[PDB]
Amino acid sequence: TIKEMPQPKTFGELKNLPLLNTDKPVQALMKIADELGEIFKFEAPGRVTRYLSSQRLIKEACDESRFDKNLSQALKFVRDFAGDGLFTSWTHEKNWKKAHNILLPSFSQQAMKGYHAMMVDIAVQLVQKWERLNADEHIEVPEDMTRLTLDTIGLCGFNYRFNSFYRDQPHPFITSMVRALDEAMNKLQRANPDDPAYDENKRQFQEDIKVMNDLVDKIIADRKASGEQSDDLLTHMLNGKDPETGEPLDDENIRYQIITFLIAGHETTSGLLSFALYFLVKNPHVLQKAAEEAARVLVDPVPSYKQVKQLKYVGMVLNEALRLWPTAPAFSLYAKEDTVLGGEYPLEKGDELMVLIPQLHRDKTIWGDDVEEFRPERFENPSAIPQHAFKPFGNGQRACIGQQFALHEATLVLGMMLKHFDFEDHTNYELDIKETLTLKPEGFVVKAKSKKIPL
Numbered sequence: 001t002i003k004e005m006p007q008p009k010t011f012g013e014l015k016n017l018p019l020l021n022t023d024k025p026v027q028a029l030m031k032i033a034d035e036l037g038e039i040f041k042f043e044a045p046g047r048v049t050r051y052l053s054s055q056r057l058i059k060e061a062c063d064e065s066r067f068d069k070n071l072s073q074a075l076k077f078v079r080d081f082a083g084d085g086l087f088t089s090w091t092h093e094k095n096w097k098k099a100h101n102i103l104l105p106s107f108s109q110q111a112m113k114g115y116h117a118m119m120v121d122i123a124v125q126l127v128q129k130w131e132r133l134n135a136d137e138h139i140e141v142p143e144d145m146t147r148l149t150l151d152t153i154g155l156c157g158f159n160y161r162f163n164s165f166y167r168d169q170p171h172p173f174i175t176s177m178v179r180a181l182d183e184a185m186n187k188l189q190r191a192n193p194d195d196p197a198y199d200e201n202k203r204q205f206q207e208d209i210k211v212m213n214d215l216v217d218k219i220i221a222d223r224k225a226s227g228e229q230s231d232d233l234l235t236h237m238l239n240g241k242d243p244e245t246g247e248p249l250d251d252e253n254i255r256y257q258i259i260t261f262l263i264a265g266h267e268t269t270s271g272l273l274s275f276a277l278y279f280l281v282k283n284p285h286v287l288q289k290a291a292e293e294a295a296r297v298l299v300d301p302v303p304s305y306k307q308v309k310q311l312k313y314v315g316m317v318l319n320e321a322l323r324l325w326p327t328a329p330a331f332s333l334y335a336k337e338d339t340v341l342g343g344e345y346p347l348e349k350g351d352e353l354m355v356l357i358p359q360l361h362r363d364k365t366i367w368g369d370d371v372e373e374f375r376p377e378r379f380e381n382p383s384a385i386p387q388h389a390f391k392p393f394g395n396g397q398r399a400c401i402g403q404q405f406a407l408h409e410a411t412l413v414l415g416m417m418l419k420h421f422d423f424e425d426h427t428n429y430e431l432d433i434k435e436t437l438t439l440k441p442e443g444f445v446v447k448a449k450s451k452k453i454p455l
Ligand code: HEM
Pocket: 069, 086, 087, 088, 100, 153, 260, 261, 264, 265, 268, 269, 272, 326, 327, 328, 330, 331, 332, 391, 392, 393, 394, 395, 397, 398, 399, 400, 401, 402, 403, 405, 406
């Protein structure tokens, strides 16, 4: 039977917009979802969004015959610097399928064998940093995880060393990319974006886009001018031809792909690693079981690709961290045609949906009563998890191309962390989640006591 959709409290002509006038809009939407349930309508002047929280409805939203990836307003603002890269392109843009066909082989489980040595290079820099801390000192977790994952995708992406472990102040490119992401997300909250109040914001945004284009376009030009054939994503993009069109990517699109990969490495994997370590220090029995696996498997000074594949429990820890705090917390869909969601909610062609991944992952009909508990054992058997219950990498053909890359890096790094150190939650850290494009545990600090195992 056709149901009226719940809607949170309104602010006259501003409708629901002021509810997201916060530095934590995703956590605000999770609290709305807790109050209103599996679906709610969110209205702003000239905009309707429907927020889905239940596996019951999200399993329908994930039907690619009925729904396609939508560019959320957030992604439309990110598109001002990520262009028609894979992340901010519509499925129907020629450059989406072309880049997708060219890059899939670069992102395969098989390509990970090739990236492994460069991931180890950065992972060993992280371990060495922590081995070199003095007795009184602590680790700034998301800070060090962001140094790591930015550097990894720099090196694997285009053989470029951001040298993040040599620095306090980020590489200039990163200061521009972070400020551009911040501007993109802040613009969601401007009820009148064309105010001159926001004129300095507009001008900084253009300068930041230039910094990004200049380093990346110079990186591409330098690579073309050298003729060097390093086994990185830039080489694959310069030489690759789409089997369908027979065309290569042009230099502008390659720039967008590189900016996109840097956004991904900086924002996502670092969040996952930060949440995984958070849950391990809060669940000492789970930390011990993961530490036991790392010690049993990582028998060599340098982990091998094959050894990373054997860190099953560490992979379960990462999936459980993705369940409770999916660092990429939402994706947007549009109805390809008029359709009825869940037998109750009529949608028109073009109607926009937001999938609230943290809420999906807390659906008690799927996960049961222990849903807030950190239990990696939930992930022992992928076949025992219902369809579309677990979506930290999005859905279908528009799912994360980087999923294998991210999980290989996170497994390697967390394996080495658990092999080399005992960890202390010395401050009894109270989770405080900072929102950019992604969720990260802000101010998360630990102490690492070396097990004194040489590299
Ligand atoms: C834990 C780490 C990561 C998470 C949680 C994550 C999550 C996601 C999600 C949820 C999407 C779908 C977005 C949407 O539907 O709007 C996505 C897309 C994408 N991710 Fe990731 N990601 C991660 C790591 C990476 C890495 C390391 C890369 C690249 C090196 C990457 C590249 C991409 C790209 C290119 C897309 C767009 C794919 C397409 O539509 O063709 N991601 N990611």
